[PDB]
Design a protein around this ligand. Structure first.
Ligand SMILES: [Ca+2]
Ligand SMILES: [Ca+2]
Ligand SMILES: [Ca+2]
Ligand SMILES: [Ca+2]
Ligand SMILES: [Ca+2]
Ligand SMILES: [Ca+2]
Ligand SMILES: [Ca+2]
Ligand SMILES: [Ca+2]
Lengths: 86, 553, 200, 86, 200, 553
């Protein structure tokens, strides 16, 4: 279902506008769930383009930070995950 | 008695003879009575100052300060020591030379020896580059204004002691430095002063047999307190009139003093350059002080860039003065240097509290609470610094309200039944002096989320109003990457998206958050240095009940 | 092609422990507070815990990435943020910086280490012992994060210096330079930098 | 966004096959969210017909139960909601 | 068109308190366990808490929905599930059911109430007092959930009975019928049912 | 002496005379010596048995049991009482009649009075419907086999006492009931018995002046122990041979006894109908017991459906018998009724433990753990009930394994290197007797999720195997709404999707969950009565590590 997957990326590939080239190792949660799992969702499917369950994290990791070109450090809190859930 | 140098270099080899001279030493004179006595140390200090063994091989002549071997050097001695060398390669040991603990100039001078595995090399294996001077160059150190004398001797003593059949000559290049023929002592004719010249990097000439060699020769000249404080060409005393600021501290007047020395350095500058405040009324001790900090500069005196000190004296306020002070004094300062006279014409003038009495303004009746409309200002707007002029609003229908902003001490007025003209007798009070005034307001009246920052688009901001509106609606400001020109639906287009968080914006936490929230913006941001935004990416909108904003295109 | 510094950054940030305590030395150095530009004290505390906890081959790479072009030498000087952590409004005198290090415990540890380690004595082979390089290394990079912070000045060479000069010195001036150029022109430390930058 | 909405229905309109006509009052969560709200979702939008956030509940209510025609009671657990979230 | 019973169900289940304690009396009555068909004890406990806590106009509607067709009369009898809660394998004798109610506290409360309340005496107007209907009502619907459970038999009328007969009776037989038809043919209770089913 | 009825009805009015007769009473005789004495009660008991006041208005004749007013009735008396009536409408008070607390037959009979607001109505306002009999009909109660006598008298005594000028006649319809002319006592000629007839609902004929009226007349006849136990037309004793079951309890033999009474009712049936077990060996008390429960039936004897009891006696086992018992006895039972003789031929035969010795079967080597292959069965398969025949597998390569299922006591064998033929000497043991046996197995070998229930589609189940497979793969069963025929990817197509949860399926909780999980299925379901599914909607698939299944189309 909602499972863990590590990846390599650039902070330029985060694309927040920070002027650097430095990188990171990023761990995300992917894969859909069972799409009903209670009576209430069955009745939501009966009543209705907004809909069923999602994949999210259940906690967050420690920080990720770096230097840009222009003389300045940049910080990131709440950016990548450890454990995944519906 | 001080040493012309600090550290001495000479080489040793195996099986040199007893009585083989190593080096002369030199000690200068601060007085002609000063007889340099010389004696050796005891332990061969090794690498990282390790005592190795009692030196019994070497004796000295005090009279010339001549080092020479009493005993000879052999592999039984040099493997006895290289084990004590802590497993490190041996090329440097040294001693101490006291002349009248840690060895330093001018009480001491440490002398090195660089031993080699081979014995004394023959006369033809010695290139004329190393027959004149050793490799590590000397560093000559002379105080100014002394009994002038001799500080250096040329001859390599093992070289001529064991290869005397090579004719070797030494000389030097309106300079007091001279080299005598037939006696190779280097002398100085008259006494030096730093204040004329201070750098002498000359050249000593060596002649072998054929090769002539040129070598460096640095001399550093020292300094004294042969100087008293001095004015900078007719500048004795400044003055000014204490006018507007009246902060706890502000520099008032500034004088410059030139003492031509350097010698009282930045450590013991507290003990000598004391700004002695000459007394008067004791009110100046309540209200003024004299600050004194140096900075040292260089100047051309006789072709060199001789340096000295510059001593500035400043009058800085000591407390937040009241308004109504009207006095004058003449404050004198004595200056020590180990003694100059200074003063200052200081006059305090009071400030009138004449607010402009008659002024009128129109207010749109659709405006919301905390609505910026008009500026109340005293007669000297951008000028008060340490006076708490507080605004009171006596009325004679509750729509408007004034609190003095503590930045300008100016009034930005806010909104806190058929009544479309009123009368607000604006009362301008003070706290430290009971002096108030009053003035007449003739106010003329002319007939969706909670905050503005929650808005996101252009017409979404322009077709809907928030909490702090003087116009009923909010206002969209719109302006690269992580930059101070960001965009927001801000209330107060000169005060909300601004960079300052005044008391208009901070009563209840909904008014102008971009300059006044305490959250944590997600996005390419750069935090506002008090708080809030200094920079933010794309579009930035806010949700203040969760205490959070967002920067996102 | 990049340079050695961005690849050494790839070397550090890929290990998550280097990255986590990287962010540890990042955070208080660049949240500007009211009427400062940062906190110097928390920032230097966090640099010291970075250069104590995380092992060698990540950090000394980025700090000692050997340079061939000019932005490399820029980033070479950039290694500890002068603007918040090394530079201030003024340079004091160097003996003042020495005694202010002497009122600091860990600083005096690193300074006695550097007195011990990168010493350019008489003729060994590369002005060093070549296997006390790491002790040379754990001297200089040891000195990071206390009040005596060395950093680069000459981008075109390897001459490092702290935040002082020999102004206002008087009698101790040459001794000052005896101290000062000891950071600036060391044959042993420069041999150690070149050796670590060749891949030792 | 994801908000609460009450409704009246029949248990026949639940359509689980229970043989009754009896009823219920049912409270659901409707309305989509802000569709990005982190860097990771921006990069998911960059990489890719599966996609962005949903509306779900954050707890559940107390039980709902009844009688059918044929002599038999029927129970329901986990069928309707109190509070709604992304 | 439905009937009065489904609309009375709409009346109960729309109030969430009636619905919640409805599920309270639902749950142990229809989870079948090993070698039973339900638990009789928990089910009857939960019916008693339903007919004590939730007020009148929901429950007595569904229990006393007036009927005009046959599936109404079915659901009229269905009101407490015979199959788990009222029926068993056997009908005992009615004095046995009476003494087994007499070993129960709450049962004897409801039975003395029903002796008191729905009594068909000599000639008042509708064989009752017409304002002791509710006490009549809180008698019969009071009797639900204890071991003496009344329920319908004759779908075509309003004659209720518990789970016994006057077999194995001998000498007390007529007294048995004096008891038994007291549930079966009461003019006062039938007037109360018709009055509550007209909308009083 | 008992009363022919229980409750008596008569009406009162205002200002009736003293000495005005109300009613006669009647008391029957169980013996001719029985002289019925009569006396009244004291307090007028009101609605809900409320004592109201001392009755001083009324006297009685014991000899006829005649009630008559000694004092007259007036509004001072009837408003004195209607206040004590607790705010309830007055139409019923009553008394007690003892003849030799709570008033009941045969010790007592309560007599009612229904007062009205009016006085005694005139003779022409009385319709002939209410001149014959009162409205509430009598209920006559006669024991059988008694001295026959008189139980009823006709005349309404206030009617003829105050309207005597109307000629009123009463009579009755091979019946012992007769009505005498010129004396209106109702008599019975000879004594009745229930065993011939038991219901007499006759008609009494009334004649006024002109109208003739017909009224009901019910008589209930009682019963006695005038009967001893009796066989049902030549059925004295049954027998059977204890053969196969040997459970703790099983009904063996059953006899029927006809006592023609009803009178010992279901309460005191413990005290009289005792099954006295006549002794013998004490082993029968270890191993057998006699159960006795009645059921009462009706029969035509002389045209009525007279009822009596049927007493069955059953032999039920008392313990789990062992295998090797080989005995016989004759167990006698005495029967009380307040005394018949019964017996039973009971013989216990042992069972051979001869398992079929030579049997072979082939196993696909691709099978997974817990793989159902073959049935081990003893010679009497579906017949053992209380014997623990446990299967032990001695071997002479570990692939197979057997545990006896406790249902059939039969063996379903499971899976717990070039070895494709083996030898498993199957040892069939018991626990309560040490008798085992053994037999030869000649087993021939012929060369994705964890469980099967996680599967969802048809080919998803058929192209992938789970944990308990004897074939390597699982098997899809596929079969209205909330019904027992549901569909699942089940392992054991006769044992997994089945309705029974055996010890094959319950070792580790992955094998066959549809019949053996303990979760909570979401969906239109109906819970399995042990556990699991009894019914489920659409498709049903399971996730057992979360301990949960789902029914969803
Ligand atoms: Ca001088
Ligand atoms: Ca001087
Ligand atoms: Ca001076
Ligand atoms: Ca602002
Ligand atoms: Ca008889
Ligand atoms: Ca009899
Ligand atoms: Ca009998
Ligand atoms: Ca099964």
């Amino acid at each position: 279902g909602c499972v863990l997957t590590a990846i390599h990326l650039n902070v330029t590939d985060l694309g927040l506008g920070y002027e650097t080239k430095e990188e990171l190792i990023f761990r995300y949660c992917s894969g859909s769930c069972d799409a009903a799992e209670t009576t209430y969702d069955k009745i939501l499917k009966n009543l209705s383009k907004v809909g069923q369950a999602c994949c999210r994290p259940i906690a967050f990791d420690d920080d990720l930070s770096f230097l840009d070109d222009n003389l300045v450090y940049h910080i990131l809190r709440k950016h990548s995950a450890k454990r995944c859930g519906c | 008695l001080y040493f012309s140098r600090d550290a001495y270099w000479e080489k040793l080899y195996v099986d040199q003879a007893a009585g083989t001279p190593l080096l002369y030493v030199h000690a200068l004179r601060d007085a002609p009575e000063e007889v340099p006595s010389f004696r050796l140390g005891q332990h061969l200090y090794g690498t990282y100052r390790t005592r190795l063994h009692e030196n019994n091989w070497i004796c000295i002549q005090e009279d010339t300060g001549l080092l020479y071997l009493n005993r000879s050097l052999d592999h039984s001695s040099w493997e006895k020591l290289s084990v004590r060398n802590h497993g490190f390669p041996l090329l440097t040991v040294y001693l101490k030379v006291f002349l009248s603990g840690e060895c330093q100039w001018p009480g001491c001078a440490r002398v090195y020896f660089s031993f080699f595995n081979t014995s004394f090399p023959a006369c033809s294996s010695l290139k004329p580059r190393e027959l004149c001077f050793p490799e590590t160059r000397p560093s000559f150190r002379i105080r100014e204004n002394r009994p002038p004398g001799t500080f250096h001797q040329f001859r390599l003593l093992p070289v001529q002691f064991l290869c005397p059949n090579i004719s070797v000559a030494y000389r030097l290049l309106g300079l007091p430095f001279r080299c005598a023929p037939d006696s190779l002592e280097v002398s100085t004719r008259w006494a030096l002063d730093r204040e004329q010249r201070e750098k002498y990097e000359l050249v000593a000439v060596c002649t072998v047999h054929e090769e002539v060699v040129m070598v460096p020769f640095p001399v550093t000249v020292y300094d004294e307190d042969d100087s008293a404080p001095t004015f900078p060409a007719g500048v004795d005393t400044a003055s000014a009139v204490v006018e507007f600021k009246r902060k706890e501290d502000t520099v008032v007047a500034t004088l410059r003093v030139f003492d031509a020395d350097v010698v009282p350095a930045s450590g013991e500058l507290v003990r000598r350059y004391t700004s002695t405040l000459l007394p008067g009324d004791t009110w100046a001790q309540q209200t003024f002080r004299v600050e004194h900090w140096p900075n040292e500069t260089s100047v051309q005196a006789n072709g060199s860039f001789v340096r000295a000190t510059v001593h500035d004296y400043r009058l800085v306020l000591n407390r937040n003065l009241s308004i109504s002070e009207n006095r004058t004094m003449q404050l004198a300062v004595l200056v020590n240097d180990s003694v100059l006279l200074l003063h200052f014409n200081v006059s305090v003038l009071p400030v009138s509290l004449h607010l402009p009495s008659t002024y009128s303004l129109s207010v749109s009746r659709r405006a919301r609470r905390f609505a910026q409309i008009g500026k109340v200002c005293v007669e000297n707007c951008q000028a008060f610094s340490g006076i708490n002029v507080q605004y009171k609003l006596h009325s004679s229908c509750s729509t408007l309200g004034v609190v003095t902003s503590a930045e300008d001490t100016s009034g930005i007025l806010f909104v806190n039944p058929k009544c479309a003209e009123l009368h607000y007798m604006v009362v301008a009070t003070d706290q430290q002096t009971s002096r108030q005034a009053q003035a007449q307001l003739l106010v003329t009246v002319e007939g969706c989320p909670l905050s503005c920052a929650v808005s996101k688009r252009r017409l979404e901001c322009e077709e809907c109003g928030g909490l702090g509106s003087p116009t009923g609606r909010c206002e969209w400001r719109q302006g690269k990457g992580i930059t101070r020109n960001f965009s927001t639906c801000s209330p107060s287009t000169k005060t909300c998206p601004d960079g300052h968080c005044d008391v208009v914006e901070t009563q209840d936490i909904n008014i102008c958050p971009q300059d006044c929230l305490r959250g944590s913006i997600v996005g390419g941001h750069e935090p506002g240095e008090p708080r809030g935004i200094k920079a933010g990416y794309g579009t930035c909108n806010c949700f203040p009940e969760e205490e959070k904003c967002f920067c996102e295109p | 092609k990049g340079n050695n510094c961005l690849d050494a950054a790839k070397a550090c940030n890929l290990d998550d422990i280097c990255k986590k305590y990287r962010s540890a030395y990042i955070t208080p150095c660049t949240t500007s507070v009211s009427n400062d530009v940062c906190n110097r004290r928390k920032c230097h505390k966090a640099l010291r815990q970075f250069f104590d906890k995380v092992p060698a081959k990540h950090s000394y790479g980025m700090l000692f990435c050997s340079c061939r072009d000019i932005a490399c030498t820029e980033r070479r000087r950039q290694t500890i943020v002068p603007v918040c952590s090394y530079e201030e409004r003024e340079k004091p005198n160097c003996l003042n910086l020495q005694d202010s290090c002497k009122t600091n415990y860990i600083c005096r540890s690193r300074l006695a280490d550097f007195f011990t380690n990168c010493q350019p004595e008489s003729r060994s082979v590369s002005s060093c012992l070549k296997e006390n390089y790491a002790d040379c290394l754990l001297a200089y990079s040891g000195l990071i994060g206390t009040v005596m912070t060395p950093n680069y000045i000459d981008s075109s060479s390897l001459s490092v210096a702290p935040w002082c000069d020999c102004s206002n010195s008087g009698n101790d001036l040459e001794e000052c330079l005896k101290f000062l150029n000891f950071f600036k022109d060391n044959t042993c430390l420069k041999n150690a930098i070149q050796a670590f930058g060749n891949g030792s």
